[PDB]
Design a protein around this ligand. Sequence first.
Ligand SMILES: Nc1ncnc2c1ncn2[C@@H]1O[C@H](COP(=O)(O)O)[C@@H](O)[C@H]1O
Ligand SMILES: Nc1ncnc2c1ncn2[C@@H]1O[C@H](COP(=O)(O)O)[C@@H](O)[C@H]1O
Lengths: 326, 328
Amino acid sequence: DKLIFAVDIIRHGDRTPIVALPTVNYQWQEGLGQLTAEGMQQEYKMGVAFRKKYIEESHLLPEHYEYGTIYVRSTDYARTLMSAQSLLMGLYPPGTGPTIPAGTSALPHAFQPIPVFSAPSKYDEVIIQQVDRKEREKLMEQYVFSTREWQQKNNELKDKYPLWSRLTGINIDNLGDLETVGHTLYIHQIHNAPMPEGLASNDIETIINSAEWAFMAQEKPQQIANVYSSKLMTNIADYLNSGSMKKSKLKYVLLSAHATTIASVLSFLGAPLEKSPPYASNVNFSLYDNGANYYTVKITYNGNPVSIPACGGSVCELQQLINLVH
Amino acid sequence: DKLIFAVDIIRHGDRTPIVALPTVNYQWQEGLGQLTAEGMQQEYKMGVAFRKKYIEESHLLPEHYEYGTIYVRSTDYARTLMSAQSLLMGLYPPGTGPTIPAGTSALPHAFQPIPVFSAPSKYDEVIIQQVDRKEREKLMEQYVFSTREWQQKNNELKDKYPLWSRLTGINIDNLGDLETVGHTLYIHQIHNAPMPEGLASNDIETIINSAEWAFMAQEKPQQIANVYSSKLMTNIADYLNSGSMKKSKLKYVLLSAHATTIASVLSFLGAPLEKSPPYASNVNFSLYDNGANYYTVKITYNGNPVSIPACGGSVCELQQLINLVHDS
Ligand SMILES: Nc1ncnc2c1ncn2[C@@H]1O[C@H](COP(=O)(O)O)[C@@H](O)[C@H]1O
Ligand SMILES: Nc1ncnc2c1ncn2[C@@H]1O[C@H](COP(=O)(O)O)[C@@H](O)[C@H]1O
């Protein structure tokens, strides 16, 4: 069994919060929504593991970056572009960069430039499907807000939304409003950033564990995942199909996505996540040739086999995967 | 007189041809139209120059990379993307990059990741204005192919187009077919790549110089420059207008464009070029604060004062330049 193509959806590394809490004065040094140094090392080390897997152990890619062989597309965010640059620095590190005729390295420490292509979210033909605000609310009310367990979570904390709106500073009427706050509190935890004064230790975990839950409840439904990840899955499907033909120089596609991208894909494959994708997460698609024209795709999420119902496990036949997309 | 904002448009570094010559057994290792080791080095050197100007001498930007202060935008190409990456290694070099709490560098050699934002040509609200090759033909037909200089040049050369077609292995029917050929031969010259056997040195030099000439003749007419450069120039005027207000952290915009971008921007401003911008060329807008709400914008090409007729010189007043842009 030979590795003849691979697709990596990754998440960006450790980041600053999107919103500041209006009752905490905390200057985030890196800015809002920005890759932290920790995040740069998280992605770099996932790059080294990729090097070991794709170049040392398999030979799927050469030792030094070659034209035609890899494609890297990011979303229209600083943090995914910078996560992508960090990771490729691990995949093709300094020492492997090109050199001028005379013989000395073209860039300091012989770093290797690799292009990270990208499009605005509204013009993205590869990763992101735009969906109108009004139409997501239509979907969200139908497949999620509707559900027994959404209702019951809301109902458990349908009275502390007053106390938390005051202490948080950003007002909370329903669980959806709570998601955005809990994620910011989670990041405050990781970086030892100050919490809203008066907010109980016990209430912190609640808002965090509730924010994760609610975020994941909105990816779980396959109907949602189909609207949001069809384009992306049609594209990965086609990449793998063209990989199987063994004509094209192209062996590897790296997509610099986020948590939603990863959770929407797995939910699409009928393996929705209970837990949030960590920083530096990857869904991986490995195309194997058995030498007898039996093309298999092994899908893994942070190293663990994903079990696709439509394939009865982590191994899909190539056409089984294309069918499941269609 | 303090510098408070700047915009650089750059051409990428040294590259391989777009089109190999089918009559030459020579293989470009980087791929077609890709950035070379020399080109990376050229873009890096300009980063050092930019660091010295914008960080050491000027204090426009800080010593270590700081959120919200720079915006880097590239066209939808490996060469422009890899050029910015390279330049940015000069502007914020290894040793200046972030450090984890344990205190080791977060990337090897303390490298400074800087995001290069981008859009495909047909989705690009900043740099490139998309013109279907149909509408380009009416512009050329109206403003370029109608000029006697264009038709004289073509008449001088067309008798040799059959011979050049065979020898280069590229179909040459008109002066514009010859432009790609001439660019490829120039690139062969730079890299000592072998020439098509029989193709006379005199003819090699005519084909190159005539290719350059037809290239710039297509960028020359201001009316052409208004179609391609209005959007990019409304954006550059807007970045500059924001800078005068001094509310934003933003101080520096890097646009990783190509020769067409540089030639078309100067043409838009009434200072069309005679000669193709060399690799790692730049056009620079520097916003100056006279100290009492009088903003000037000094415009240079490769460090040299561009003389804009509407401004009577290389220096415009900020609103005079915004009006010049709006005029189109
Ligand atoms: N741990 C989490 N808890 C709650 N929401 C999350 C979490 N991780 C990601 N999200 C959601 O995913 C969005 C984009 O994630 P990302 O760009 O990967 O940081 C965030 O704005 C949240 O809405
Ligand atoms: N010396 C030259 N001779 C002919 N065309 C040129 C020359 N320099 C630049 N160009 C044109 O500019 C196009 C794109 O510029 P760039 O991407 O900067 O190399 C080329 O494909 C040519 O049409």
